[PDB]
Structure 1
Amino acid sequence: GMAKKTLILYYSWSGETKKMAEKINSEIKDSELKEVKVSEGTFDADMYKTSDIALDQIQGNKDFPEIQLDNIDYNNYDLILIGSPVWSGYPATPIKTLLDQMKNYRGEVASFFTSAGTNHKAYVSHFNEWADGLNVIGVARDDSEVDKWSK
């Protein structure tokens, strides 16, 4: 059918997912790319401190983080690709806030993740939870399923 008008959104703590999002942007004709940020002080330069902050959000003890991103009408797109690192089998916590803000999006969603190779099944299942109510068509590592998602 008609080419899917595609938005690529990503959160990146150490820059790897940003590079992947840029690569996917280059692969998908006319795609738009937008970064999701959090304020300085939300996490930490130290990965173990960052993990512990995310965990306390996951466990319900601290609120999920507020995010900063451009104003977007999500219903301008057919497909929204959401990029994140894998954080102990979950997407990064800013993604939960993002997905909540996308509540009224009627199109297709997929997530690409970057990782060091582990806890992928958990990422998939948790992403789908966090995206409940949205039409999730797939979750995959890197750009491995970009072609599939485009059809």
Structure 2
Amino acid sequence: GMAKKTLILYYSWSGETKKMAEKINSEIKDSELKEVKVSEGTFDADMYKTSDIALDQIQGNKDFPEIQLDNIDYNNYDLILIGSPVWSGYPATPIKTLLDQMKNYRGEVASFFTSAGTNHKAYVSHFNEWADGLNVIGVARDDSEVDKWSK
């Protein structure tokens, strides 16, 4: 058979990327919205902790927390969007592990950012460095280039 499906993975707290993800599921034929959780924290305090500062996993740390999600096989979709914050160049490493699972994907990679306060141009170049082995076709903010990450 055949079907180009789409998928939207969006890492952030309850509110942040939620608004910016739910729209896109509704602008694309045969798209969907899945969760990116993290490992760790949990038994540390009342709730998790593995994001309490921006520049954690970058400079002074290097080792980073793992990801969690459901039993999803990227091979069953043809288009994959990725959503995350930015404020000092690259202060997150959620997508790192996921990109390294996607090694046998067939289809297209885009990665929308939902932040720009002091860091725009850097992130575009920085994401390249931390993806460089998957097929990327655009790197923009918001949902204003989804019309090509589909066509």
TM-score when normalising by structure 2:
0.82
Give percent identity, aligned residues only: 100
What is the deviation of 1:126?
1.5
| Structure number having the greater helix percentage | 1
Greater CA drift, 99-108 or 134-143: 99-108
Instruction: Report the Cα distance in structure 2 between the residues aligned to 1:147 and 1:43, rounded to whole angstroms.
Output: 43
Q: Is the 8 A contact 2:41 2:49 kept in 1?
A: no
- The alpha-carbon distance between structure 1 residues 43 and 98, as it changes in their structure 2 partners (threshold 3 A), is farther
Over the residues paired in the alignment, what is the CA RMSD in angstroms? 3.7
1:42-87, CA deviations, whole angstroms, 9 ceiling, x for partnerless residues?
8999999977755231236241111111111111111100011114
- The alpha-carbon distance between structure 1 residues 48 and 33, as it changes in their structure 2 partners (threshold 3 A), is closer
Instruction: Report the Cα distance in structure 1 between the residues aligned to 2:43 and 2:90, rounded to whole angstroms.
Output: 16
- 3-state SS in 2 of match to 1:118: coil
Greater CA drift, 137-146 or 82-91: 82-91
- Pairs aligned (count): 151
**Equivalent residue for 2:96?**
96
What is the deviation of 1:23?
1.1
| Structure number having the greater strand percentage | 1
List, as ranges, runs of 4+ consecutive aligned residues in structure 1 with deviation greater than 3 Å. Answer: 1-4, 42-54
Greater CA drift, 60-69 or 46-55: 46-55
- The alpha-carbon distance between structure 1 residues 43 and 84, as it changes in their structure 2 partners (threshold 3 A), is farther
**Equivalent residue for 2:29?**
29
What is the deviation of 1:104?
2.1
- The alpha-carbon distance between structure 1 residues 45 and 92, as it changes in their structure 2 partners (threshold 3 A), is farther
Q: Is the 8 A contact 2:54 2:91 kept in 1?
A: no
Q: Is the 8 A contact 2:113 2:142 kept in 1?
A: yes
Instruction: Report the Cα distance in structure 2 between the residues aligned to 1:45 and 1:148, rounded to whole angstroms.
Output: 44
Instruction: Report the Cα distance in structure 2 between the residues aligned to 1:51 and 1:148, rounded to whole angstroms.
Output: 33
